[PDB]
Amino acid sequence: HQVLFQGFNWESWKQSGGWYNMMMGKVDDIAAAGVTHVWLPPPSHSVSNEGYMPGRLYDIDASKYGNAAELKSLIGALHGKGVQAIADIVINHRCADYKDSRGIYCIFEGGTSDGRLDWGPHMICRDDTKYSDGTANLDTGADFAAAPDIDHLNDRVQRELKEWLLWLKSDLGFDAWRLDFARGYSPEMAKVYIDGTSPSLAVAEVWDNMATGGDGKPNYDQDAHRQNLVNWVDKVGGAASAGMVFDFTTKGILNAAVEGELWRLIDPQGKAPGVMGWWPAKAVTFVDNHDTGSTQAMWPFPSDKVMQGYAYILTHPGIPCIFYDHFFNWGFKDQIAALVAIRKRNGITATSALKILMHEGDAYVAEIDGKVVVKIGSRYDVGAVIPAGFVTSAHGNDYAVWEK
Template sequence: MKCFNLFTLSYLFLSFSLLTNFVAPTLLFQGFNWESWNKQGGLYNFLQKSVDDLARAGITHVWLPPPSHSVSPQGYLPGRLYDLDASRYGNKVQLTTLIATFHSRGIRTVADIVINHRTADFKDSRGIYCIFEGGTPDTRLDWGPWAICKNDKPYADATSTHMDTGDDYAAAPDIDHLHPTVQYELTQWMLWLKNEVGFDGWRFDFVKGYAPYITKMYMDRTRPCFAVGELWDSVVNVNGAPIYNQDAHRNELARWVQAAGGGVVSAFDFTTKGILHAAVLGEWWRMKDTYGRPSGLIGIMPKNAVTFIDNHDSGSTQKLWSFPSDKVMLGYAYILTHPGTPTIFYDHFFEWGLKEEIIRLSSVRTRNGICEASVVNIMTAEADLYLAMIDVRVLVKLGSRYDVRNAIPSNFRIAAYGTDYCIWEKQS
């Protein structure tokens, strides 16, 4: 009888969705990790075989790795930007085929845009690598040292004109985004990725490397359907633990969002990640700020916050800021039931054996229409218990405290559960 009821509810929800032109809440999937360049048979081919599972999880956008030729196999030291056949993830035909398959399932694709820096193919008369090749028979993106920020030594020379507008990136020449030729040719390359290759959106890498108004310019000129920037700063810590009030940290993210696109672009919610690291270890009081809102960027700018547990930098084999490994599902129980745009990481979905548990949570999100702007009512935030109502439809319990029966309305039923978490749905 229970199986019949679940099937009936799913069928009714699908019918309602079709009749009302329901748009699924945005759910991002990071489709790679730090070692995916070495995937047997190629990453693009692997993802091609995994589209059904991603569609079943309710994924609406897949973030793919940098697609161009790169000195590093991961793609983050790009050189010949138009050369998609030199990527270690696969070739251009495999990429465009994968994107077309995603599109056939209603899933959009997000390109990793690495434009703060670029590696050169040739040396100049000084013996410095600063002569760039674009990857085409013509002169597109064929630059010299004039395209490098004036203060980026030893790469720049007398032809360089503008100072860097952001942080230095030591591993490769910092590109001068104030130069009109750089602006025009990078814009044309991004439009080529969009119109010919098929990408729908952008993930801007290392946005600390150039001023936010530069991001806004590329946003205005390319108009992606979705865009998110990586503004990575650690949360404020004292004696090895995050302080309670992280307003300064999340306000920096919010200021970048406003300057980089007037609210059109989003930012990865590093604030939520940093606070959640400590909360899952028995400090759930951290997840409610002094105004009763969620403590991260989702508490002040949820429509522009992209939440995540780990990515190719923080987790994977780099482990630069890994989430507590035995608490990962607690993290997903939080981000998949709360506002903002959640990100599911490749490792957790494909390699950790958590796929079905993640899908149960993502299904609750989709079924109840939890979205970027969903309303959170935090009922309890104590050391061992976090209890919140989302959109008056979903009740979320996180933490080791077990008995919360008196707080559960009689018309709510369990929809998903796991170690130290339980999710209830309101019954129609």
């Protein structure tokens, strides 16, 4: 059994009294709902309030989310209920605390009194010319415009970032990683960090744009999009590796499919159309995160159909990730916990078998491990496609589940 939970949103840093302190009062409900791992935000000093422009990686006390004591108390509470803590690891780029003789912020500070992570411009990808000194290797992935991109081919960078990651485990208690902006460096570089730190899992945010047609909707065929994700997993080490990816292919398809286009939820081979259909053991599915939803709203799930997204991901193969706001703020707590209970009760896991029974515009119905059937869509009647022996279980707005 494995169910992830994103334990923050884009406004969390503002929480009066501290976000981790507030989360202490949320631990029992998260664990009782069947969550096994909670993804926490970047914990270090950051030039931006939300944590995504880290500077002094060891300076946990500088975070807006709370200090190291408050973070360790929350991780200890999660562990007390048997739930793991996943740290948001932001290493594609990094802000430097000091200026060099050129007046450029390219002399870094790790946050410890010794030289750990106190890099210079030789550690900045040479092609990030706003900051580099032209001497490093070219970036192994995309650039993040607002800050120096780090040259992961540099041996000192690799060694000192692995030391820092191991310290997040040994000192703070983190168990696993979520790799931010993983399209910023190659999967071969991600492999150095994952293999060198043995996290229980490392879920990477590899977010490529989805191919769209002239009407603005994603294409029915997203094979190229999921092919890039499975190739990333192969390059990080495949089944041997602790690495896995967020299923952005399923997110993009599901965003469109629930708008009366549920025929999008099966490919021409009879499989789920996202990474779920090709390598479910490596696909972390989700309805929204702090970038797609929350107050950034870059690619929000249709608001009136969010429970159909959960009926889908919580009953299907792949590893589902529940978003904080949906569980605590939108009123879906009981419904989401009920769906996870159905998943756990029936022994459904990332590699459960999926048999799709109907895939029409207003009705998608699927059977998982021969034990659970789920329907989403506005169609009133799908009775004839429910196999014998199934009894109604949980239901809500445009979704229903049956158990056998």
